[PDB]
């Protein structure tokens, strides 16, 4: 009926608390925000 709900911080997984890393990731656009919406959108469906 349902899956194991999950959520992944796309910034911490790639850049493990690195100022040099995070500053470069900000130039790639909204790739990070997209993935946090899909997983959040999936987790809600598992409760429905």
């Amino acid at each position: 009926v349902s899956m194991t709900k999950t959520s992944v911080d796309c910034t911490m997984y790639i850049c493990g608390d690195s100022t040099e890393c995070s500053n470069l990731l900000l130039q790639y656009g909204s790739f990070c925000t997209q993935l946090n919406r899909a997983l959040t959108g999936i987790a809600v469906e598992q409760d429905k």
């Binding site: 911080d9 910034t11 911490m12 608390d17």
Partner: protein, 49 residues
């Protein structure tokens, strides 16, 4: 960054928020100190040779 309510409006990009729950950010924890440990070396390297 005034209050959590304003953080929500900046997340959704709207001045009026509907009833519900929304994600804002991560609960990061900054470290307080930094530990440094090295072995008890006493010799200086022979780089003159």
């Amino acid at each position: 960054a005034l209050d959590p309510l304003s953080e929500t409006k900046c997340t959704l990009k709207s001045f009026t928020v509907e009833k519900g729950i929304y994600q804002t950010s991560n609960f990061r924890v900054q470290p307080t100190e930094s530990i440094v440990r090295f072995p008890n070396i006493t010799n200086l390297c022979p780089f003159g040779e």
